[PDB]
Amino acid sequence: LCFKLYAKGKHEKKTWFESRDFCRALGGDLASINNKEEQQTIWRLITASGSYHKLFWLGLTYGSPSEGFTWSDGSPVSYENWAYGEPNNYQNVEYCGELKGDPTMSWNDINCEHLNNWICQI
Ligand SMILES: CO[C@H]1O[C@H](CO)[C@@H](O)[C@H](O)[C@@H]1O
Ligand SMILES: [Ca+2]
Ligand SMILES: [Ca+2]
């Protein structure tokens, strides 16, 4: 699949669910990062667009307590790149995953209603 960055001003930022719906309407989904190669592809896309250090929704959403975090596209959550100490469900309200678009490419769980950039796959 092809990844596409949506780096938006405040007017066009989206919640996790809004971002998921946008990517699905176009024929894809929010991006799943299933290995280091995908991660490095997205990092290069971030550098090519000058989007260094921006935050982006990924397809990470909590499933059942048993499943834990899942990918919206249904791929297995095998590879992980959570930031140290994450996911921490800070204040019990963090059920969606965002990418910190710096060289670490780390993930953090945050409130699903936060307005963010996002990355689609198509
Ligand atoms: C204070 O809350 C923020 O910082 C902590 C630690 O980084 C994260 O876990 C959390 O999701 C928020 O981004
Ligand atoms: Ca993937
Ligand atoms: Ca967190």
Determination method here?
X-ray
- Give the residue from 104, 70, 108 showing the smallest Cα distance to 89: 108
Quick one: 85 exposed, middle or buried, by C-beta within 10 A (0-12, 13-18, 19+)? exposed
CA of 85, closest atom in ligand 1 = 9
Q: How far, in Å, from the CA of 90 to the mean position of ligand 3?
A: 5
How far apart, in whole angstroms, are the C-alpha atoms of residue 86 and residue 78? 16
How far apart, in whole angstroms, are the C-alpha atoms of residue 92 and residue 31? 24
Pocket of ligand 1 from Cβ distances under 6 Å: 86, 88, 90, 94, 108-110
Residue 20 phi/psi, 5° resolution? -55, -50
- Give the residue from 122, 116, 120, 121 showing the smallest Cα distance to 56: 116
Q: How many residues does the chain have?
A: 122
H or E segment at 18? helix 16-25
Q: Are 35 and 79 in contact, with CB atoms under 8 Å apart?
A: yes
How far apart, in whole angstroms, are the C-alpha atoms of residue 56 and residue 65? 24
Q: How far, in Å, from the CA of 7 to the mean position of ligand 3?
A: 21
CA of 86, closest atom in ligand 1 = 9
At 62, the amino acid letter reads Y
Q: Are 20 and 108 in contact, with CB atoms under 8 Å apart?
A: no
Angstrom resolution of this structure: 1.4
